């Protein structure tokens, strides 16, 4: 009861064939312009640089491992031996393979065989200005002709565009009511339930009690 608690040579797929008869003979043998291609590699190192730099944090390695793939990504399918010039062995004490496979349980039970979403606080600031009578439709169109206008982003490489987006954010102020609208828009549905607010108040009361104990 305490006992219960590069492949090797096999005779299974060689039994009852001419290959067994050949091997059992025992005769000797031995085994005897537009820059497309340059742009392919430049984006390959840039992706490799991004994944290497982002993987220096332990949180991202955990997020990437638990991240799934997208079916929107998988789309496209539908929608010499140098030779010399010179009854089975495995028996099962009982086709049998076809009988064995269809004696499985599963075969026996079967009988009768565009949306615009305002996420950034700065877009909220432009929304608060436009919706109130502070900035008109004429003022928004006229002030859109600035130095950040008429700049193309269509065929440009990802390493060029991501460098710009990090270093070309326009500096225009936001309002606190615009930022307040964004957090209350992006608040989750289980962010502030009765259980978590209760333990948060209990934790803060306990923390004051230890301070009074230490001052004692």
């Amino acid at each position: 009861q305490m006992h219960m608690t590069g492949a090797f040579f096999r005779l299974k797929e060689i039994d009852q064939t001419d290959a067994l008869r050949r091997i059992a003979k025992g005769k000797m043998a031995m085994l005897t312009e537009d820059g497309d291609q340059l742009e392919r590699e430049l984006d390959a190192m840039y992706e490799h640089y991004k994944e290497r730099k982002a993987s220096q944090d332990a949180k991202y390695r955990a997020k990437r491992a638990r991240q799934e793939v997208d079916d929107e990504e998988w789309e496209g399918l539908s929608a010499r031996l140098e030779e010399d010039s010179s009854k089975p062995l495995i028996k099962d004490l009982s086709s049998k393979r076809a009988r064995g496979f269809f004696s499985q349980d599963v075969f026996q039970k079967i009988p009768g065989l565009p949306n615009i979403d305002i996420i950034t606080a700065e877009a909220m600031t432009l929304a608060h200005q436009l919706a109130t009578g502070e900035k008109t439709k004429a003022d928004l169109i006229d002030e859109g002709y600035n130095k950040y206008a008429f700049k193309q982003k269509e065929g440009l490489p990802d390493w060029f565009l991501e460098d710009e987006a990090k270093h070309d954010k326009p500096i225009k102020p936001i309002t606190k009511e615009a930022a307040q609208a964004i957090k209350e828009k992006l608040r989750a549905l289980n962010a502030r339930p009765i259980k978590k607010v209760a333990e948060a108040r209990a934790r803060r009361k306990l923390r004051q009690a230890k301070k009074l104990e230490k001052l004692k």
Binding site: A58, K59, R61, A62, K63, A65, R66, E68, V69, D71, E73, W74, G76, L77, S78, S95, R97, A98, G100, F101, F102, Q104, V106, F107, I110, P111, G112, L113, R187, A188, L189, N190, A191, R192, P193, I194, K195, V197, A198
Partner: protein, 488 residues
């Protein structure tokens, strides 16, 4: 035979994929070519066999598209597995959408196609194209029929809900169920609405060389660092998935309450009472006020809707966390107590009070009334700090309602008043004693407030009319009730 020679060739493919799968990558596609035989039998045994191989072969991880010797061997075999499994799901879906009536010797293709789908749903889900698996199930669950395949598709989804801990499989299922219910304009069988109630997220010396010893040490520290990172990410992901599921679940709940679908809104209030404590604190008072607006709308069948929303409000404050937040969250149930008091005279007159393990979705109106009075008169919390005047107000009215109600309902009400005397005793003992009757004012039966009826200025005499009622269980009910009156 023709049907014979497939069975070895079916067993030919599946057996070597079990032994060494990577050696043979066209055998998935070889399983496809042996499937379009016009003879109906091998269509059956192939679909089961494709279910058999993909259960054993599919790994525990998804595999990315290639894009762009042992590595090329693994890539060819894995990409062949995807193309086979994508094709099997297409031939599963067109087989389930096929015509159901056929010969009575066996169910034709469809129930085998559905039982293959439900087996894959609880064995595959992590692997790709689970939306294609689920879309077969949601399509049958929108058919609005009671049928064995409709039943079979039902336990598959709640098996998925009860067992899924990561939450990705549950989110894709509740997204399709939510989008189906709006597309159908809420004509579902309300077994699929109870599927949201089954969600789980909401609820001996081996020698080692010196190089092996140092590699196993560094692997331990790498796994140690990866353990706190995985624990923090899995916790943060679980809250986020719960946030998205709660948004889609509660949006379906409120759209049913707006559309006023009668059979559906009984199940919504059960889900609402179950899951309100998970959602934000500010929205708890909103739910208690949306229930008020529903009751006012029926006050403009209609007895069941008002009692359903009344017992749901009491079931919200039933919960432990909501009970401790009565002072902070100003949750006053005085509206539901007073509306229950004003409807007791009208409820005795209406004759559809008895029509043949949940809390809200009960069928008969009488037991909905019983559970409302159990909350008002016998609460689990503060049963000794109950206003005796509220006790005396309902005791007189329940005695009055027992006079003009069916036999089973009258026996139940006498059982309820029996429990009030045993629990409260001296508080309501003066009602049956006419010498302890107050003389402050007179009794107002037709009152719009619980406080203003002056219940202690009247005496209960319905026991004279009810020891004479034809049902002796009504007669036995009094003799049990007057027994505890004398036992005080």
């Amino acid at each position: 035979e023709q049907i014979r020679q497939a069975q070895e060739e079916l067993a030919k493919i599946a057996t070597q994929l079990n032994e060494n799968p990577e050696e043979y990558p066209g055998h998935f596609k070889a399983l496809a070519r042996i499937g379009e035989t016009p003879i109906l039998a091998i269509q059956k045994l192939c679909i089961v066999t494709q279910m058999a191989v993909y259960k054993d072969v599919i790994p525990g991880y998804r595999i990315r598209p290639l894009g762009e010797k042992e590595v090329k061997r693994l890539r060819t075999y894995e990409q062949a597995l995807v193309a086979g499994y994508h094709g099997y799901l297409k031939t599963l879906a067109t087989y389930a959408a096929s015509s159901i009536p056929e010969d009575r010797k066996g169910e034709p293709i469809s129930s085998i196609a559905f039982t293959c789908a439900c087996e894959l749903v609880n064995a595959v889900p992590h692997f790709n194209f689970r939306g294609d698996l689920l879309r077969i199930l949601v399509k049958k669950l929108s058919t609005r029929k009671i049928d064995r395949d409709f039943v079979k598709c039902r336990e598959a989804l709640e098996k998925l809900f009860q067992d899924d801990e990561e939450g990705n499989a549950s989110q894709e299922a509740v997204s399709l169920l939510s989008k189906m219910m709006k597309a159908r304009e809420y004509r579902v069988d309300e077994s699929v609405l109870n599927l949201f109630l089954h969600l789980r997220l909401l609820s001996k010396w081996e020698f080692r060389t010196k190089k092996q010893r140092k590699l196993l040490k560094a692997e331990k520290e790498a796994q140690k660092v990866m353990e706190q990172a995985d624990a923090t990410v899995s916790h943060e992901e679980r809250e986020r998935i719960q946030s998205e599921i709660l948004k889609m679940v509660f949006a379906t709940y409120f759209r049913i309450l707006k559309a006023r679908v009668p059979h559906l809104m009984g199940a919504v209030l059960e889900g609402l009472a179950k899951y309100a404590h998970l959602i934000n604190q500010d929205f708890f008072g909103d739910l208690l006020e949306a229930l008020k607006d529903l009751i006012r709308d029926t006050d403009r069948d209609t007895s069941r809707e008002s009692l359903l929303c009344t017992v749901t409000a009491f079931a919200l404050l039933e919960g432990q966390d909501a009970h401790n937040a009565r002072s902070d969250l100003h949750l006053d149930l005085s509206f539901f107590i007073t509306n229950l008091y004003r409807s007791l005279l009208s409820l005795s007159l209406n004759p559809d009070l008895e029509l043949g393990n949940n809390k809200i979705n009960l069928q008969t109106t009488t037991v909905l009334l019983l559970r409302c009075l159990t909350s008002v008169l016998l609460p689990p919390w503060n049963i000794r700090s109950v206003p005796p005047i509220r006790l005396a107000a309902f005791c007189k009215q329940l005695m009055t309602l027992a006079l003009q109600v069916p036999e089973k309902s009258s026996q139940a009400i006498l059982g309820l008043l029996q429990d009030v005397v045993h629990t409260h005793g001296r508080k309501v003992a003066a009602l049956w004693n006419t010498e302890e009757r107050k003389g402050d004012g007179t009794y107002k039966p037709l009152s719009e407030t619980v406080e203003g009826s002056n219940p202690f200025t009247t005496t209960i005499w319905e026991g004279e009319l009810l020891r004479k009622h034809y049902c002796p269980k009504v007669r036995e009910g009094l003799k049990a009730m007057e027994k505890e009156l004398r036992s005080i």
